[PDB]
Amino acid sequence: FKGVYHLYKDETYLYQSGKGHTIQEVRIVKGLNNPDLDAAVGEDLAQQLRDELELVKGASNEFDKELFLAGEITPVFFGTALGNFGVDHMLDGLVEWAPAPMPRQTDTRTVEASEDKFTGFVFKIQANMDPKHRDRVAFMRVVSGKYEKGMKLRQVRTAKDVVISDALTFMAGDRSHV
RNA sequence: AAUUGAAGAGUUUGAUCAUGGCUCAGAUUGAACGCUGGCGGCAGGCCUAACACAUGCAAGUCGAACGGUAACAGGAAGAAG
């Protein structure tokens, strides 16, 4: 494993072995026929890249944002989460293409994310240990509207209005105020 | 007018009386447990570890004390939305 050639940026990010604990030095080789790709990767491996890329173009797909959002093509990234190599592109891809908050359906209406008036829905009451409480802390999604600490909300099911104060924000498997 | 209220029974012996302990009926509870459980009023609720505590809150207030401008507000010598 020498790295990955980016098809759309037309350049080659070079993998360094065992820097998986931090982020390695970004070391690019610009051209796909740049004779430094041959030097940095060995001309043998360099041609197999060129060969495979030929076949790839005749049997694959161009990334189309519309078909991706329709769930009909997947952008495939090759990498290694252990070597911490490939993660950041798929992130660039994540930020670049992936939807802002989407509308959730209800027995009333299509609920736009753009709307105001808070509208969350739980979805999980995680395996609450939890360092000094039963807590439970139900995990809510927030479909629309802005939550603010002292606001008053309505539990639709029990039809009882509830005031909110202690409302967790989870900084990675960890309660945080708030 | 304002403290004027006191019950005994069971068991030692073949039987008896006396002694004498044990036990029972009452009232009481910050109670617990078992079975059960429909309301409401009022009150009560760590008696054990003065054992250790995540999180929020439980003490601040005066510009008619003072230098003052960091915010929202009125208006300004001048330009104007």
From Swiss-Prot:
Membrane spanning stretches: none
Annotated localization: Cytoplasm
Family: Belongs to the TRAFAC class translation factor GTPase superfamily. Classic translation factor GTPase family. PrfC subfamily.
Purpose of the protein: Increases the formation of ribosomal termination complexes and stimulates activities of RF-1 and RF-2. It binds guanine nucleotides and has strong preference for UGA stop codons. It may interact directly with the ribosome. The stimulation of RF-1 and RF-2 is significantly reduced by GTP and GDP, but not by GMP.
Name of the featured protein: Peptide chain release factor RF3
Lineage: Bacteria, Pseudomonadati, Pseudomonadota, Gammaproteobacteria, Enterobacterales
Shown stretch of the complete protein: 179 to 356 of 529
